[PDB]
Design a binder for this molecule. Sequence first.
Ligand SMILES: *[C@@H]1O[C@H](CO)[C@@H](O[C@@H]2O[C@H](CO)[C@@H](O[C@@H]3O[C@H](CO[C@H]4O[C@H](CO[C@H]5O[C@H](CO)[C@@H](O)[C@H](O)[C@@H]5O)[C@@H](O)[C@H](O)[C@@H]4O)[C@@H](O)[C@H](O[C@H]4O[C@H](CO)[C@@H](O)[C@H](O)[C@@H]4O[C@H]4O[C@H](CO)[C@@H](O)[C@H](O)[C@@H]4O)[C@@H]3O)[C@H](O)[C@H]2NC(C)=O)[C@H](O)[C@H]1NC(C)=O
Ligand SMILES: CCCCCCCC/C=C\CCCCCCCC(=O)O[C@@H](COC(=O)CCCCCCCCCCCCCCC)COP(=O)([O-])OCC[N+](C)(C)C
Ligand SMILES: *[C@@H]1O[C@H](CO)[C@@H](O[C@@H]2O[C@H](CO)[C@@H](O[C@@H]3O[C@H](CO)[C@@H](O)[C@H](O)[C@@H]3O)[C@H](O)[C@H]2NC(C)=O)[C@H](O)[C@H]1NC(C)=O
Ligand SMILES: *[C@@H]1O[C@H](CO)[C@@H](O[C@@H]2O[C@H](CO)[C@@H](O[C@@H]3O[C@H](CO)[C@@H](O)[C@H](O)[C@@H]3O)[C@H](O)[C@H]2NC(C)=O)[C@H](O)[C@H]1NC(C)=O
Ligand SMILES: *[C@@H]1O[C@H](CO)[C@@H](O[C@@H]2O[C@H](CO)[C@@H](O)[C@H](O)[C@H]2NC(C)=O)[C@H](O)[C@H]1NC(C)=O
Ligand SMILES: *[C@@H]1O[C@H](CO)[C@@H](O[C@@H]2O[C@H](CO)[C@@H](O)[C@H](O)[C@H]2NC(C)=O)[C@H](O)[C@H]1NC(C)=O
Ligand SMILES: *[C@@H]1O[C@H](CO)[C@@H](O)[C@H](O)[C@H]1NC(C)=O
Ligand SMILES: *[C@@H]1O[C@H](CO)[C@@H](O)[C@H](O)[C@H]1NC(C)=O
Lengths: 116, 333, 330, 208, 105, 326, 331
Amino acid sequence: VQLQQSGAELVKPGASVKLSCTASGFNIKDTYMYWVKQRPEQGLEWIGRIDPANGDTKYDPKFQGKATITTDTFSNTAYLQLSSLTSEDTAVYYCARKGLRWAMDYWGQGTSVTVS
Amino acid sequence: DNTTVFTRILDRLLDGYDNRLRPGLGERVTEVKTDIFVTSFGPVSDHDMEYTIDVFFRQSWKDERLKFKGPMTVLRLNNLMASKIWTPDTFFHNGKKSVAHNMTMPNKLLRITEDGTLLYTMRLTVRAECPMHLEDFPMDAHACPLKFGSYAYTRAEVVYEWTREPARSVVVAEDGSRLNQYDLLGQTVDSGIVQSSTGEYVVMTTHFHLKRKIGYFVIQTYLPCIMTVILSQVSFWLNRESVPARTVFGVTTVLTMTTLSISARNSLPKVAYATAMDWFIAVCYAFVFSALIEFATVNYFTKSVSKIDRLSRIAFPLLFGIFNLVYWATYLN
Amino acid sequence: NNITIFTRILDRLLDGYDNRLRPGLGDSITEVFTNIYVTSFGPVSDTDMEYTIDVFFRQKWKDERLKFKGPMNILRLNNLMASKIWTPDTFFHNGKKSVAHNMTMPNKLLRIQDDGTLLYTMRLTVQAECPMHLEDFPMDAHSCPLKFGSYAYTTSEVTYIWTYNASDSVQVAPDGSRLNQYDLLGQSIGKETIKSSTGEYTVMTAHFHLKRKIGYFVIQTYLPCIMTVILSQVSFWLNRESVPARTVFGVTTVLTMTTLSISARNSLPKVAYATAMDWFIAVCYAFVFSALIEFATVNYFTVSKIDRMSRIVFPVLFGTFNLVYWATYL
Amino acid sequence: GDVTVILNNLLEGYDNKLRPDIGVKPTLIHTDMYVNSIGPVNAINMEYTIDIFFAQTWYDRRLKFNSTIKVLRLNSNMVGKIWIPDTFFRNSKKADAHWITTPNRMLRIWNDGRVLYTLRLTIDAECQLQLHNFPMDEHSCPLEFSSYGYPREEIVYQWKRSSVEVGDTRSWRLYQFSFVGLRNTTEVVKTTSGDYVVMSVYFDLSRR
Amino acid sequence: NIVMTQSPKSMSMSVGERVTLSCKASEYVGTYVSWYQQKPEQSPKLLIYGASNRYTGVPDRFTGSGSATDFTLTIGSVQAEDLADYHCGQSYSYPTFGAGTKLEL
Amino acid sequence: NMSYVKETVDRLLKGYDIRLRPDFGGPPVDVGMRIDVASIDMVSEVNMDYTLTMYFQQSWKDKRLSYSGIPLNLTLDNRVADQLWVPDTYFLNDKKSFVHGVTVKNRMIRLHPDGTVLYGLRITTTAACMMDLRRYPLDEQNCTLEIESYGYTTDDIEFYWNGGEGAVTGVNKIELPQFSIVDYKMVSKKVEFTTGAYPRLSLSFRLKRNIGYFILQTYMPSTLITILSWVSFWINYDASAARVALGITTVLTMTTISTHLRETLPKIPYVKAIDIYLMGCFVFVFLALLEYAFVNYIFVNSIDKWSRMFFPITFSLFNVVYWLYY
Amino acid sequence: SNMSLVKETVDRLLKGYDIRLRPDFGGPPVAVGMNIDIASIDMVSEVNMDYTLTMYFQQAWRDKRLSYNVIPLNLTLDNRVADQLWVPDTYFLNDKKSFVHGVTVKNRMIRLHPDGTVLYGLRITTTAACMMDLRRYPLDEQNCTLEIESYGYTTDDIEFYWRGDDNAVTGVTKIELPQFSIVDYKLITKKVVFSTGSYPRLSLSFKLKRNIGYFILQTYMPSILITILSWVSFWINYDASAARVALGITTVLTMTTINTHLRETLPKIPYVKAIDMYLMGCFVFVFMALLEYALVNYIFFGRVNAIDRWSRIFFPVVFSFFNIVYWLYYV
Ligand SMILES: *[C@@H]1O[C@H](CO)[C@@H](O[C@@H]2O[C@H](CO)[C@@H](O[C@@H]3O[C@H](CO[C@H]4O[C@H](CO[C@H]5O[C@H](CO)[C@@H](O)[C@H](O)[C@@H]5O)[C@@H](O)[C@H](O)[C@@H]4O)[C@@H](O)[C@H](O[C@H]4O[C@H](CO)[C@@H](O)[C@H](O)[C@@H]4O[C@H]4O[C@H](CO)[C@@H](O)[C@H](O)[C@@H]4O)[C@@H]3O)[C@H](O)[C@H]2NC(C)=O)[C@H](O)[C@H]1NC(C)=O
Ligand SMILES: CCCCCCCC/C=C\CCCCCCCC(=O)O[C@@H](COC(=O)CCCCCCCCCCCCCCC)COP(=O)([O-])OCC[N+](C)(C)C
Ligand SMILES: *[C@@H]1O[C@H](CO)[C@@H](O[C@@H]2O[C@H](CO)[C@@H](O[C@@H]3O[C@H](CO)[C@@H](O)[C@H](O)[C@@H]3O)[C@H](O)[C@H]2NC(C)=O)[C@H](O)[C@H]1NC(C)=O
Ligand SMILES: *[C@@H]1O[C@H](CO)[C@@H](O[C@@H]2O[C@H](CO)[C@@H](O[C@@H]3O[C@H](CO)[C@@H](O)[C@H](O)[C@@H]3O)[C@H](O)[C@H]2NC(C)=O)[C@H](O)[C@H]1NC(C)=O
Ligand SMILES: *[C@@H]1O[C@H](CO)[C@@H](O[C@@H]2O[C@H](CO)[C@@H](O)[C@H](O)[C@H]2NC(C)=O)[C@H](O)[C@H]1NC(C)=O
Ligand SMILES: *[C@@H]1O[C@H](CO)[C@@H](O[C@@H]2O[C@H](CO)[C@@H](O)[C@H](O)[C@H]2NC(C)=O)[C@H](O)[C@H]1NC(C)=O
Ligand SMILES: *[C@@H]1O[C@H](CO)[C@@H](O)[C@H](O)[C@H]1NC(C)=O
Ligand SMILES: *[C@@H]1O[C@H](CO)[C@@H](O)[C@H](O)[C@H]1NC(C)=O
């Protein structure tokens, strides 16, 4: 019932950052896991979809290649991989559990990434 | 023996099992995930305002009493196992007469994974009700629905959902279109709640958008009626003395026009209102009586080339052209 | 408890009971008492020589093994008990495709009494045969039979006797009659003994006398045949020199008679004899065909005295023909 | 009583899945058919309807009893408890028995093991109709039946002097045809599963 | 893709009256929208699923409505603790989101 | 917690006697039945039947199904019904019925904690309705559906509509393609057969046929072919072949229209109102053919002059006395 | 005794047999060989887009649990043991309505073999759907199939093969049809992929060809003779309107009427069938003859004799050229 994410990140542009969030109180093999991008003072932008029981991943066409989503079964955890960081990638990221009638039920606390 | 391992697994699964009770009867809500693979959208019968669809109906739900630990993660079993476990009671709300095919064996599927997740697939030739408003016949479009939900299971007990994204949860096969008259434009799904005399039920809706192709009726009705009008239009070029010739012109156009009127209606049902084909037949039929009444007045005024014939050689085909350019541009656009 | 008293009664009756054997297999005969309550006499299909009938087929016999001593006199039980006690295997000899209705519960009855008498009522949709001889069509009067008897039980084992007198044993519901062609005059019943290559059987029959109504075939076939004869007699009242107008009278009344000979025919099956309907169309065709022959003789000899005599002889010959035809068959 | 203990002793240790003399000799089955009525001969669809009393007779050494009762005239309940042959009609488009008010079947077991099994059938059998010389056409409509699973080495079919027997030939449904005569033949066909004994009855129909 | 065009950007009114929103869809989404609130320095929370289904913990003043294309979220007597930003999503297809409607005094 | 539910159902169905009804030696079992009309499908006149699908629900209090455990109505699988008492409610008008069996058998059962058993099916009946067809096509039928017990008399079973008129709902939204349902009535009856006294409920529907199909399919070809035969009066008398071409073609078609009317209609013995109107103008063509025969026997002489002053008067007077009567 | 030995062997085989598990359930897939003996093809109907096929469908796999040794001969059991042995879940994808014949018993067969080669033979009358490309009717050629597929078992649980390669399907050559003619039959094995897995598939397909002889006598030749009858009006005088007008109107009307009465005996297809193209061209020729007489009457009375000679030569030449084009295209 609780989705705990990682801490805030701050790396140089062009590098790579490991981002993760851990789900507790349930299993991720039942419901889908959704990743979203929230730029400051902007709207929400959907990153991608992952089905942890199948391993199938679906991404936005504008986020294909630069971002991919992986998962594991034992730790019950979802992972992000971000490559070639730029100035426009400075945002805060949430992982969203798919809920009743496809509604993005639970949300993580948010990890703020920053480049310099 | 080597096969004794699966036999004792299945007999341990079915030991102490009650198939009369849904999983989590007093604890939670049974979520059933549904998708449909339309193998062939069969023919739409207008007379009965119905349509036939063959689908690979697929349901999936979580059952905690079917957990096992063995060498195989997925148990792909036969139909026999399907009747000994709990299965949801999905029925079609607007179905008329549907057959679950059982040749040569019952066309069912059952796959029990190690966490208890099930998958139950069936072949259903659902004959459903497609209500039609044929005011624009034959230049019309319909949205034939397919509504299904759980009987004997209220919203508080069994809910339904689509297992993939709802845009991708009803898949129509590419070769599978047995429509000869219409064509299938696209699919459309929706989920809602229905409040019935017993309780509130979750209903899943699937609208199939259709569109009638005007190929049979632009050769059986419209073009023969145009040719019948044109054959009444050539009677104004005849002689004023040839009374039996223009007489047989008029009466044969009247008889062909009325037998087209009779034989055209032997296609759609017996609706109280009048379709666009009825308006076209009525206007062409009135043009035929106008051509006949013109000759009747000419024969009344006979004893030189008639001015009535010279006016009707010009006015009548241009009025037919204006009627065609009004009617077709009104109904095709 | 209270209902467990009747549970012990029914468990005691079926303890040691054998449904494979008739009651008194070596003690005596099995007398089966039969009623039929025709709720609705269905439509008689003329093409298939068949008819549909919905009955309440009541049977009654005595089984001494089904005897109880309790607080009730009749045990009005449900359908399930009937499948595990003995019932007679009555079939219908002339039946074609008969269905027992099962909606919602098996439409059956079972009323085991204190003395051992049983009652067994069903609800059937018998589609039995009917031998039709359409040589007086459409003034015929059939008698469609319904013959029923036991199977695998000869007259030395199971015999059939009606419950009441022979008049009030096959009743017809007062409002139940779906006949549109015919109308039910009455029913006559009887009990026979037919012998096949296995033994002698009991073949109770019920005959339903029918009579065909003329009123459809008047306006459909009889009356339009009359009018086109009179319409063909208009041609004697025209001018001699009017060659094409009387020619159209010749070629339309002949053509519409051939259409009426086939259009009215497609209703009746393809039999081998000529009906009384065909003996009216062929004479009506002969009046019309001789009218065109009369015009051709007038046109070959071109007011004609043959045409003036044709205005008197031709109508009174058809009038005398209608007197003969509608008095012989009526 | 008397017949109950006889039947319960007959049916104990009995397998209906095995034919009599499974590894000894083929089971000889004597058939015979009593035509109630030949129905209409459909020409555009090329079949005819026939309503018969199909009767079969074979020997079963397991159904042998030594009691004063010489015959056991039973009902259709005992049909699906003993071995019955899998006779099917090889040129029938569709057929069905009759089940009202009880399954129209008969079973009689003699004391030497002879079993008689009679059922009532309505068969839409194929009859090829040559349309040359229409409508002066005379046809020999066939009716072929055999066993489905058991080959010639396991069931041999055999006719009886009293074979096809027609009714009154006047209450029948033949309108444009007339029944001329019937002849019984037997033969052996070769299929992909073995050799089967096929019994055919030819019905001679002449159009009127 | 599906384009969410919720309007306007922000509204500035007082406490204790009716305010309505609007979420217009480019293509058909059938009763599959979702509404979330966005406080500053806070993760989004679910309010309405389906078209008009109130989630657990949502007060009765929050009332949504829906159709095949046009959607709205009606607020009755909005209070001081509801000054946040509102987002409209869809999930009939792969999920997208709108711009965002803010509330001001 | 599922052990509390399973041990209750395994106790209710243990010691149950399906062959005995609620209060077998005591009072009659009163069953409240509701009908949710799904749709009245096809009202066929040729087979004198109408096809009707409905959600037929019954409700009687089975005492032996009492439990002081689970405080919720247990909706058991449709399969349990075959281990429970069910009333034998049948339909007298029934010609063909089937309860739907896809994807499972369409049945519902709820065991309320006192004794109630909420049993309900989904039945499509082809009920027989005897039609009075004299006023056709301006007719009005009163089709009925009769539900009755079979093996249980009035001393054993009793039938009553739940919530009075509320028992049957849904008939307002039903659209017929041709008819128009106007009324629906309910009535509790106790018919007396020879076997015993039985409770019968009858649900009756009123259907009014819409004329608008027959206006353009039958009446307007019939009316305007009489106008077609009235062009025959506006031809001069010497045109022999021209004037006969009117009359001989209107009367063969009027016979053809009458023959091509009664193949969609059943094998009725009496005269329908459409047949009165069709034969009403059928003799008007005979009056036109006799008019040409009379004026050619003369060869205007006022015969072709009075005809235009009598034929529109007679047919319009025939049209007033026909439509006002129906 | 042979009977008691067979009884105890069948009792040993059926004891402990798990109906729910396929052979080698946890191992390699089982190979199922298929034979079909075509009995008849009844109704190749174009209005319902299906063909009724009666066949002796037969399957042959191996079941290592059903192995008998004490009895060296083949055991043909009753048809009531098929509810106790595992059989594959073979279905037909284009099937609409099928039934196993049940006179006098259910027509099915099991013949156990020493190794356990279960011989499962069935008599099935199926009504398989076959979509027809009626754009060359009646000079067309149909490809009607029968898609044999396994339902619940994927490729790693079952595999299908024709037994005997091209000799697997017999009796096709003995089939005769009322209006069609079987040209060739071909045997295809492949695998189809769905969202639940990959499934094996066999397909029996026939190349039906329509016979021209019925139509060319009752649809083509009446239209040809009616178009020849239209040109008789050119040899009548320019004053015989009653006569000539009747000829023309009657021909046009008859042509339209046959066009119509013909076209209700086909499905409501929205395209143009070769016969419809020919019956439109004949209608165009007859309508041109009627307007030719109308032009002759106009140029005589309203406003000449060379038009009859021009037309009497023109119209047969143009009609023969149209026939050459039509019989050169649709052939
Ligand atoms: C696909 O699905 C269908 C539908 O579910 C399956 O078809 C069902 O098969 C059942 C088992 O064979 C059968 O149940 C028996 O029915 C008997 C009565 O017959 C009914 O059905 C026939 C229809 O068959 C005819 O019509 C079809 C049309 O398609 C044709 O294909 C057939 O060839 C026939 O022409 C009706 O005509 C009848 O009026 C009935 O409605 C019952 O008698 C039988 O019960 C008895 O037999 C059982 C088995 O032996 C036994 O356990 C039981 O105790 C009964 O035994 C008594 O009677 C037997 C009679 O021989 C006697 O020997 C015993 O001693 C005892 O006295 C079953 O109830 C279903 O009725 C049938 N459903 C339909 C609609 O046809 C089909 O099998 C399935 N296919 C596959 C491959 O799975
Ligand atoms: C004896 C019987 C008559 C014989 C006649 C022989 C001679 C003539 C012979 C041949 C000519 C005809 C051949 C082609 C017809 C068949 C093909 C077809 O259907 O075409 C198209 C019709 O699509 C339309 O929309 C057609 C509209 C036509 C309007 C009427 C035209 C004339 C109007 C003024 C007339 C009066 C003017 C003068 C007034 C004074 C394709 O339709 P479809 O297949 O549905 O494809 C679309 C599908 N979709 C909608 C999903 C996208
Ligand atoms: C359609 O036809 C039916 C059957 O002919 C008509 O049914 C009749 O309806 C009346 C009025 O409801 C019944 O009378 C009532 O009977 C009950 C039962 O005891 C009684 O409580 C009432 O006081 C009243 O007397 C009548 O019995 C019934 N006919 C039969 C044979 O039972 C019906 O009226 C027709 N019309 C409509 C609109 O349904
Ligand atoms: C009737 O129609 C069917 C379907 O269109 C035809 O079946 C097709 O037959 C061809 C050749 O036999 C198949 O091609 C094969 O492709 C594989 C691909 O790997 C190749 O390995 C083979 O050598 C062969 O070339 C084709 O797959 C098959 N179609 C389908 C859908 O399976 C058939 O030929 C037509 N005619 C008759 C008389 O049946
Ligand atoms: C119709 O007939 C069938 C067969 O008799 C009935 O089905 C049986 O009903 C009893 C109820 O006591 C069950 O015990 C049996 O298991 C059922 N047999 C089956 C499922 O083959 C059926 O109830 C009747 N009525 C309906 C509504 O179909
Ligand atoms: C049991 O059936 C098998 C399979 O048909 C028979 O084996 C074949 O029999 C034919 C004909 O006798 C031979 O030509 C083949 O060579 C055999 N093949 C094999 C692999 O053995 C077998 O003969 C049958 N057994 C009997 C009838 O006792
Ligand atoms: C049956 O066949 C035999 C020869 O096989 C023949 O002698 C006998 O007469 C036939 N049955 C008849 C016609 O009684
Ligand atoms: C149980 O059934 C009763 C009887 O109609 C009904 O009032 C009630 O709402 C149902 N549900 C619960 C949870 O009690």
